[PDB]
């Protein structure tokens, strides 16, 4: 009776955008797997923080399904996500089974690369807007967190807490989100 | 002409409170050393995120001095910091040379353990207030970030961005802090 989250971690990911959702989701009782795109080895993030993944993506793929798939940002991280055929397979399967897909900052650009969720309202980091909107396949929002159907997006490192709590609210409900929020000492 | 920051990473540290300052300080051009209390090996944080330190504290001690020493929170992490004789030596030396000392959430309780900065105004996580105030050696503040002399404290994971930017403002000045802040998409 435990919800499951997959966080996909590639070289160049924004480490704040990775750790904040993982930590908050584990505070909410969610079973989180931090899966390394290239394997089980330690991943050098964009600001040189080095994180050990829980598993390789190959292994984690086989322990599905997941109630949410999480794509952090970071420009080079999103580029690696966008180029990965394994990411494409995971995202297409999540869309087909109507599971949640959550991406933050530059992360949403991987959705475009993999042709995921066309027609949805999305947000990105302002600097990633032009890339996300190539072709007019999505409608753009400037909300700090945006949710349309099964696609949940958010704008930047500074929105990481709101992004994570929205995942909690979607999976476990508003009361659990509010309970997890209070000890964090967030402003609003 | 490059400022230097030491972040001390112990088992049980709050991983958000570790990564956010490290990332933000590196965005500000600060040379940050993430030093592992127990050695060079990977450190399991409070919500099971595993981080590889840049060096052992023993090695990092010898490459001083540092313009700021940073103590993350997490209850078990702060307890390990409070029990460490090496932490005591580093903090006493930083105080004597009038360097900045920054601690967040439960981190400030290590200051009490090591008899650092008595008489200063400090804040902590609300749940750590009683521990920090045993003996009346500090004056308590409910400000989200508090700075008195060379002691800079902050309250919780949700204050980590404000805490980090205050370190930047202290080391590199208000203009660099404002420049680093804008791409983060913080609310205020």
């Amino acid at each position: 009776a435990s919800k499951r989250a997959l966080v996909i971690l590639a070289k160049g990911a924004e480490e704040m955008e990775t750790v904040i959702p993982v930590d908050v989701m584990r505070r909410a009782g969610i079973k989180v797997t931090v899966a390394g795109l290239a394997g089980k080895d330690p991943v050098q993030c964009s600001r040189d923080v080095v994180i050990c993944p829980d598993a390789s993506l190959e292994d984690a793929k086989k322990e599905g399904p997941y109630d949410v798939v999480v794509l952090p940002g970071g420009n080079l991280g999103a580029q690696n996500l966008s180029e990965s055929a394994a990411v494409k397979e995971i995202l297409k399967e999540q869309e087909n089974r109507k599971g949640l897909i959550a991406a933050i900052c530059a992360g949403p650009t991987a959705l475009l690369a993999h042709e995921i969720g066309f027609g949805s309202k999305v947000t990105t980091h302002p600097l990633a807007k032009d890339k996300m909107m190539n072709g007019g396949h999505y409608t753009y929002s400037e909300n700090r967190v945006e949710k349309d159907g099964l696609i949940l997006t958010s704008r930047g490192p500074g929105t990481s807490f709101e992004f994570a709590l929205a995942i909690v609210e979607a999976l476990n409900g508003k009361e659990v989100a509010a309970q997890v929020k209070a000890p964090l000492v967030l402003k609003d």
Side-chain angles (χ1 to χ4, degrees), chain A:
Chain A
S2 198
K3 308 275 178 175
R4 323 180 94 260
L6 177 68
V7 178
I8 302 183
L9 177 55
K11 177 163 222 301
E14 221 301 330
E15 42 269 73
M16 296 187 284
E17 296 172 14
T18 298
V19 171
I20 286 171
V22 166
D23 185 323
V24 167
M25 283 190 285
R26 288 179 168 150
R27 286 169 179 257
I30 298 165
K31 192 181 311 185
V32 178
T33 301
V34 179
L37 182 63
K40 176 95 160 298
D41 298 310
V43 174
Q44 182 179 30
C45 295
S46 68
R47 269 71 189 180
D48 273 348
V49 172
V50 176
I51 292 172
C52 293
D54 299 320
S56 79
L57 187 59
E58 195 196 342
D59 294 326
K61 177 204 299 291
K62 306 167 182 298
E63 298 181 297
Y66 299 93
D67 307 285
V68 61
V69 177
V70 177
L71 305 180
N75 280 337
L76 302 179
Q79 290 174 23
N80 284 311
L81 295 172
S82 297
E83 288 175 9
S84 164
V87 176
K88 187 183 311 292
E89 179 184 340
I90 286 165
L91 296 172
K92 291 193 174 293
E93 167 195 338
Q94 185 75 348
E95 195 181 34
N96 282 333
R97 64 179 296 275
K98 294 163 86 196
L100 186 60
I101 296 175
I104 182 164
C105 205
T109 66
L111 308 181
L112 169 64
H114 295 315
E115 298 189 346
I116 299 293
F118 285 6
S120 304
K121 186 173 294 185
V122 300
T123 194
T124 68
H125 193 278
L127 291 180
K129 172 181 185 243
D130 290 337
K131 177 112 183 199
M132 183 75 185
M133 288 300 293
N134 184 10
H137 293 295
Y138 309 90
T139 297
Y140 198 76
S141 166
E142 294 181 29
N143 281 344
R144 296 177 56 82
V145 179
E146 191 60 69
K147 188 182 176 308
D148 193 16
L150 63 93
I151 303 297
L152 189 163
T153 52
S154 194
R155 304 207 80 186
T159 64
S160 288
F161 282 104
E162 299 148 81
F163 174 71
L165 287 175
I167 296 169
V168 173
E169 185 172 334
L171 261 42
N172 304 136
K174 181 261 201 72
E175 298 164 41
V176 170
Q179 294 168 353
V180 164
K181 172 177 165 179
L184 297 173
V185 195
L186 290 170
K187 193 147 91 147
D188 287 317

